[PDB]
Amino acid sequence: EEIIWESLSVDVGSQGNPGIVEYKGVDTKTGEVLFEREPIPIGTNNMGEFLAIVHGLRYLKERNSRKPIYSNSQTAIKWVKDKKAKSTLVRNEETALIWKLVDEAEEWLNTHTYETPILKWQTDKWGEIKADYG
Template identity: 35%
Template sequence: MVTMLLDETSPHRPTAGICTDGAHSIKRGVSQYRGIDLKTGNELFNKELGNQTVNISEFLGVVAAIKYIIETGYSPKVIYTDSITAITWVNNKKTASQKRHSDLKRAEVFLKAMSSEVDTIEVRHWNTTEWGEIPADFGNK
């Protein structure tokens, strides 16, 4: 199981790890996610998903960060997201979405198949109240 650490008590904004965010534009009918390296500010990945939901985008963003860490040996093995839903779905290695999208099924299979490696990665909640918007935010609010 992925560790869910709520850093809500820490006044210090994280400076290392990967932060992810998802977004959905009703006007454009496009969902997307991306990951940012907290240390450098560089975008590590960015993907458009078509017309999905923000929860699906948030979840797939965290899964993409997990894959990135496993494939590249990225350190520290810490991911931040502001989505409790994404953290819950990752911990369960299964979504609660009624939508069926091939990326969702692949993500669930990946989380289960790679469980021993996935479980070495921490997924933490980004405390927006204390730290401001997550750096991966799309600014669509």
Template identity: 45%
Template structure:
């Protein structure tokens, strides 16, 4: 089984809804982040892309025994740190409500148990949470509206 961040019938055509006025269209001068998690191996990875060009700007993983929510959280923090280094105030899109809520709390509220295999994931989580506490950022974290805009451009395409 491939790396997958959600379950959907492969044969089902994706019909997009017309976006209401309060949602509109995505900002093209932005980055999108996403994570993928393999349901059979537990491997997790994440990436970020620049929406205007589709260029990948970072890719991390795979990491053993992670979760999709952790990957989504780490992807947002990675994007924030990346944009801070570039002196950029571009917004970041994520399709994960959970990860966005964790960013606001500056804490990944995971139930995942620490094991020797996922120790690097927990070390990254600690660094990410510390970064959020110690840094301020002007970037907006926005929800990618998949049902209106289609798949997140940072999606790994393995569903």
């Protein structure tokens, strides 16, 4: 607002929602793929992007980066700030993996500090988030 080009953009990829979910973190300016999560059979868009932002936080923290993270998801950003992923997705055998990851990402947020700013990507003005799965 305007744009920190030297940043990490995190994206979620969803077929049906709920359904197969994956995510990745990319360099905002170049589009270089910095990390990617192999598809999880059942999750939601919001769960996936929550995990993406937390994966981003961890990736930047261990590399001592001052870089911010951009997400186009009001929801995932709010969940990260709250340290709580308020998903409606049922907890059952089929959803146990995503919920395990989510519960662990929440635990990470509850037990760590980070300086990374988490910024909203303004799709209407800046086009789509870098490397959007679309």
